[PDB]
Amino acid sequence: EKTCDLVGEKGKESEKELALLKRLTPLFQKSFESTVGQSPDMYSYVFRVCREAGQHSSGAGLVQIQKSNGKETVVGRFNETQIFQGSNWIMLIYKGGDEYDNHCGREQRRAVVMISCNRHTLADNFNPVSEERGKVQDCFYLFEMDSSLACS
Amino acid sequence: EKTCDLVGEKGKESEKELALLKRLTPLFQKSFESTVGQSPDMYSYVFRVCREAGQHSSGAGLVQIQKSNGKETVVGRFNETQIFQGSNWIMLIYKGGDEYDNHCGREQRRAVVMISCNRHTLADNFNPVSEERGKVQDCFYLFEMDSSLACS
Ligand SMILES: *[C@]1(O)O[C@H](CO)[C@@H](O)[C@H](O)[C@H]1NC(C)=O
Numbered sequence: 001e002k003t004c005d006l007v008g009e010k011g012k013e014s015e016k017e018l019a020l021l022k023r024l025t026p027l028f029q030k031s032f033e034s035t036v037g038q039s040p041d042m043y044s045y046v047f048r049v050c051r052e053a054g055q056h057s058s059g060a061g062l063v064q065i066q067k068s069n070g071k072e073t074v075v076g077r078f079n080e081t082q083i084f085q086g087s088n089w090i091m092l093i094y095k096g097g098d099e100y101d102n103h104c105g106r107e108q109r110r111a112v113v114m115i116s117c118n119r120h121t122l123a124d125n126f127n128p129v130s131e132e133r134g135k136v137q138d139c140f141y142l143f144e145m146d147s148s149l150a151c152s
Numbered sequence: 153e154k155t156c157d158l159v160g161e162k163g164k165e166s167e168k169e170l171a172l173l174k175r176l177t178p179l180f181q182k183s184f185e186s187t188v189g190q191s192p193d194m195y196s197y198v199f200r201v202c203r204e205a206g207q208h209s210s211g212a213g214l215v216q217i218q219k220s221n222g223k224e225t226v227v228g229r230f231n232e233t234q235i236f237q238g239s240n241w242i243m244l245i246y247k248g249g250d251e252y253d254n255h256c257g258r259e260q261r262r263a264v265v266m267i268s269c270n271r272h273t274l275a276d277n278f279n280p281v282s283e284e285r286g287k288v289q290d291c292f293y294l295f296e297m298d299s300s301l302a303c304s
């Protein structure tokens with residue numbers, strides 16, 4: 001089966017990153033969702049680690065769904081993954097998402113997920129911090145979530 | 153004196169963001185440095201919160217200095233600031249940095265600083281987690297630091 005493909009020349013992939021990637025495997029089969037806003041402008045976010053996250057769109061690790069019409073916006077693809085480790089957290093990044101084409105310009109979207117250390121849970125509390133959705137215009141997608149895996 | 157200029161309109165800056173900004177004022181007159189790599193390829197990083205960080209450049213909140221010749225690269229300007237608050241951390245973003253004229257593309261550089269909560273210190277432990285420097289080619293600048301200000 002397919003997994004996350006690190007950003008770099010096939011092989012040049014830092015041993016370090018690959019170590020982090022492996023550390024996250026227990027989350028692979030899991031799925032994280034979050035719904036924000038109020039009707040008719042409610043949006044939903046589905047996040048998966050190195051797995052398909054959308055129903056329709058393919059290759060997405062994080063998708064934004066407009067509930068009023070079910071349209072899926074790819075925020076990041078797991079075939080362009082970057083992963084870093086800070087003091088007591090891990091930052092996961094999915095690049096190559098659908099382009100803005102609005103006040104944000106036309107660069108591609110990327111998904112940034114802050115995985116904070118929480119010794120009391122495998123993985124939960126997934127929620128958006130910064131978004132580009134409706135009235136919210138950050139031109140940036142930042143998500144946070146808890147996991148004992150990110151504990152150093 | 154010149155402070156950070158939030159990204160957005162002009163009087164459409166979010167109270168929320170302006171709230172975080174004021175929250176960080178105690179660090180305005182501080183300076184943070186970090187030196188990495190080995191000679192002849194040592195690079196130095198200087199970071200300031202809403203204050204000038206360069207010695208030759210201007211409008212920069214975070215600069216990358218090549219020590220073999222003193223050339224100052226601006227990674228982010230505090231006139232294009234974005235700030236977000238997570239569960240127990242604050243993320244400061246400086247946009248509008250010199251453009252990548254290499255393998256990274258030609259988009260402008262941006263400075264991303266992870267400010268984690270540490271009740272035992274006002275501010276310290278400024279360190280680079282991700283960089284575009286020398287043979288390190290992340291095409292991303294991620295920094296981390298400790299500060300009780302980011303608490304709660
Ligand atoms: C990856 O993102 O998959 C999409 C699928 O459409 C391609 O368009 C990209 O070129 C792929 N990027 C890389 C670096 O493999």
Ligand SMILES: *[C@@H]1O[C@H](CO)[C@@H](O)[C@H](O)[C@H]1NC(C)=O
Nearest residue numbers: 157210211229230231232248
């Ligand atoms: C920030 O200052 C630089 C200085 O050259 C300028 O080019 C840039 O347009 C400014 N950005 C904003 C949003 O004012």
